[PDB]
Design a protein around this ligand. Structure first.
Ligand SMILES: Nc1ncnc2c1ncn2[C@H]1C[C@H](O)[C@@H](COP(=O)(O)O)O1
Ligand SMILES: Nc1ncnc2c1ncn2[C@H]1C[C@H](O)[C@@H](COP(=O)(O)O)O1
Lengths: 520, 520, 123
């Protein structure tokens, strides 16, 4: 598209309607972009002896980027409700990215007054990493996404990437990337940017919860025709009754003893924590007692491990040591905030397919029992994969991640984003943005010296993201009502999901996705 | 249709699927029919001096009838949920009635043993009052409908009608009806009955509740340009300031004083009752203090009067003297049951359009105020209709009535069934049923005497009712979540809407229809 | 497995009466029976749990048709709000009198051959 100065290069498209078979979410926000790194690429690295498991090496780029890898970027509270309460599952389909109404303001600090004006002849630069040649930095829960509330304005984040490193140093195999060596479209006021993307085939999310259990799958009325051993010694114990091999036919009575066809999902035990700050051990163990992995001799915390249940029945107070995603309430410092200032997510719908995160896995034998030796039991704390296991993945919440770029390696197992969502080989490419550097005043004499005197300026405009969603409708013969998400009809202070007395949108609680029931 | 003995004349069609634009409810139940009134039409009437406001005159017919004027006859608990939580409104469209799998069993009491067998050569008789010539006895909350639970069997009710009466006596203008003077189809085993009906145009029900109020409709920020009088005397009161006419311009501050364009709905004050059996007056006033009407010098209790709100804000304990429909729990005598044995329905969603049932209506002047006379106020307890009034009708619950035959008179006002539902000029006609009388053993000598010796027999079979429902989808731009009906996810004793330990379906609570919000 | 053909026939409905000390059994011709197949897989699948009531190994043997019972999500002896109650009457079913029959055809999906072999080599 190509138009003029006094002619808007786009309209405000923010709406969503339903097709019963699918739903299209249109979102528009206002963005602002500073000049990052002073038009410079900078080599960043770990502090000279400041930390060990946090060593790193990379670069800081003068470029910014757009992101909307949060569900609340596209769905409104209400829409999310309809979605959750009605559909077995859902998925992404298409994508439409649009940049418009661009304005480049240049600022000057004269005396003690900052004046801002229009630099019409100035441009901005956009390009999309569709060949996936730039390090994919999205899908890491970073901030700078689109505001949940449409009326809010946001600052466009800065691009920074990491590389292979040996402590504070780097290896010869490390990689340096210049985004200037990429063809980019430059835009003046009245120019716009267009982009269309098509999601790959990716399994529906589980917007459902099982009404049956793995162990409670059989028939309560009929007995099995299979036999198991339940008595090794205990006979008609009185006279001459040491031991005897006795077998029983499985019945509704021997419910946790019946033959089985399937196993629970894998596991990686997490430490149990209480929300009550006195049930816990009087010691600081969020690192020395937490489950972690290490690569290249570098410890890294296994935060959202395999999908495991948060708590067993009749507790609802013990959450796993970081066994789930925790969201921070609006207005709360990034450094050591209170327990009443965060929102911990409960994964208690997957109890029927998944092992409890804090609890064990089960029992394993590890000896040759006999008259000479007593049978030994081992408590299994870590279980790899097994032929016959079935599990449910995590959950997506209104403010959770949407997709994630599956790493390009030789092998993957069950490539679903650990933080939750859709694992994509080729995910919505990265869209870069940056203000074209404008040389300040040059000398009448020639200078070979690198240019570093530029006019200070920032850009602003609108951005629009349209996404189509395929839906999986609900087909259940459940007689009684199922559970639905709802607002408290009671007389209330402030309205859930709303601005306050001085204009600040706030998301009260996290929103699960599993409210509807399907069988096994 | 015409087939044989060992050939079922129909299948069990009980299911419901959705079309997003409409929903079709198919229901099948098993019915049983005795021989009523001993194959006789009987003249019934009021007891010789047993009651005065309960005097009556009519007849008892040997016929039975089919009824399904209850929503739970067609919708399952779950379906009702989907319906309620998703649609602005709904309505009836088509109808399909089917009778089949008929069996006529004749019983004989020989000694002390009742033997039951097959009388194949016996018939049953059906016909549908489509000319509306038989007194419409449906839409009166009578019992004998189709069981909420599909597995339950029901007894087919008996037909009885009333006529014009003068106390215990009747007038010459009274009417006697013989259902034998109607053409009816007789069916043997293997015969079936078919019937299709088409609902008329009738306004959608309000499956919504207003998010705005009548008095709270204007703009909170801007002031009106209209003026009202708010001060008659109170001036700069000190010296020589008796009285002065002063007017104010309506503002957000004068909120309950601003000019108005609309009025609340009509009213007929009801007496206030408390659920706490000690707040009330120590006197029995359910008749001597209740609002009632009288025709022909006969008192009749105004049970579900005009649609009025049950209680004002911050109470939820005071219900109107019969100002709403009350349902009896499963297993509870018809005579003086406990308060904890009934379900009282709350009409607290229509607070914004309707006057409170127990509270007053407002203030009216009734004198010519002056220096000589002080202004007089009258508390209005009864308000007819008024140009500019707007009201919401009652509500339909999972177990409430569906339709009602609007009486054929010279005039109607707002012909909506007082008990709630769809007022129909021509509602689903009455379907009659009766076992064809079989003469027992006759004498070898001729007798002119009326025959009264018959073989005792009862009929049984299946019945199927299919109804199509037009839906009005939800189109709201509400940002925050709306309230939804849901089951308590908590650890529970018995499951809501389910059979118990010995096989008895029970409906826990009444189900409203207004969960979604629309503006004014 | 590849294909499947299910057929019900020669149905007879006998009704019994205990009069004095003698049980008499006779024919109730006008009586029906009801069949339906969960093809939408909406009823809890209770098969494949080694239960009894299958078809007799020996053809000459007669068998009793088992009863349907299912389980749901539970919290000890209690149930959760997310539990599910199923009524098989809310399913369209075909009713049969004497002389009526039931027909059904099914097609297995692609599933790897079973190992009717044993390796002559070792790992
Ligand atoms: N989010 C997501 N994306 C892709 N695949 C998923 C996902 N979640 C579960 N799976 C399953 C579906 C396939 O059966 C399997 C392919 O693994 P492979 O290692 O590709 O053979 O992985
Ligand atoms: N249930 C029902 N049936 C029919 N009409 C209804 C109903 N509820 C409200 N109304 C309104 C709709 C029309 O504007 C008006 C016709 O009244 P009339 O007296 O017919 O001129 O009555």
């Amino acid at each position: 598209g190509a138009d003029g100065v006094g002619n808007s290069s786009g309209n405000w498209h923010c709406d969503s309607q339903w097709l019963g078979d699918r739903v299209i979410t249109t979102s528009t926000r206002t963005w602002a972009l500073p000049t990052y790194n002073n038009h410079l690429y900078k080599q960043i690295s770990s502090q000279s002896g400041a930390s060990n498991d946090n060593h790193y090496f990379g670069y800081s780029t003068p470029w910014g980027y757009f992101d909307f890898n949060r569900f609340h970027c596209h769905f409104s509270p209400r829409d999310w409700q309809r979605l959750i309460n009605n559909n077995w599952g859902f998925r992404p389909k298409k994508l439409s990215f649009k940049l418009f109404n661009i304005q480049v303001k240049e600022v000057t600090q004269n005396d003690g007054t900052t004046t801002i004006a229009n630099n019409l002849t100035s441009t901005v630069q956009v390009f999309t990493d569709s060949e996936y040649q730039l390090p994919y930095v999205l899908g890491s829960a970073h901030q700078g996404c689109l505001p949940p509330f449409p009326a809010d304005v946001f600052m466009v984040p800065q691009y920074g990437y990491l590389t292979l490193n040996n402590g504070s140093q780097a290896v010869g195999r490390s990689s340096f990337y210049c985004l200037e060596y990429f063809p980019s479209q430059m835009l003046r006021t009245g120019n716009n940017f267009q982009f269309s993307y098509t999601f790959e085939d990716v399994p529906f999310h589980s917007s459902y919860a099982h009404s049956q259990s793995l162990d409670r799958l059989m028939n309560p009325l009929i007995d099995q025709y299979l036999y198991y051993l339940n008595r090794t010694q205990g006979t008609t114990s009185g006279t001459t009754n040491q031991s005897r091999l006795l077998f029983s036919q499985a019945g509704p009575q021997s419910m946790s003893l019946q033959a089985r066809n399937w196993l629970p999902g894998p596991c990686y035990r997490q430490q149990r924590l209480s929300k009550t700050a006195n049930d816990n051990n009087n010691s600081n163990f969020p690192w020395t007692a937490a489950s972690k992995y290490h690569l290249n001799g570098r410890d890294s915390l296994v935060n959202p491990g395999p999908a495991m249940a948060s708590h067993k029945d009749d507790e609802e107070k013990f959450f796993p040591m970081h066994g789930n995603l925790i969201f921070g309430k609006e207005g709360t410092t990034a450094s050591n905030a209170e327990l009443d200032n965060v929102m911990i997510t409960d994964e208690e719908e997957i109890r029927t397919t998944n092992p409890v995160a804090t609890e064990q896995y089960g029992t394993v034998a590890n000896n040759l029992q006999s008259s000479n030796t007593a049978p030994t039991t081992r408590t299994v704390n870590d279980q790899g994969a097994l032929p016959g296991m079935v599990w449910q993945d995590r959950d997506v919440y209104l403010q959770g991640p949407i997709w994630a770029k599956i790493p390009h390696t030789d092998g993957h197992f069950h490539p679903s984003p650990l933080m939750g969502g859709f694992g994509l080989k080729h995910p919505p490419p990265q869209i870069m943005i940056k203000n074209t550097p404008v040389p300040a005043n040059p000398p009448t004499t020639f200078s070979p010296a690198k240019f570093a005197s530029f006019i200070t300026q920032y850009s602003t405009g609108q951005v629009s993201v349209e996404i189509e969603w395929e839906l999986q409708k609900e087909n259940s013969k459940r007689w009684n009502p199922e559970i639905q998400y709802t607002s408290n009809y009671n007389k209330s202070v402030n309205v859930d999901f709303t601005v306050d007395t001085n204009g600040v949108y706030s998301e009260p609680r996290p929103i699960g996705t599993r409210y509807l029931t399907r069988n096994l």
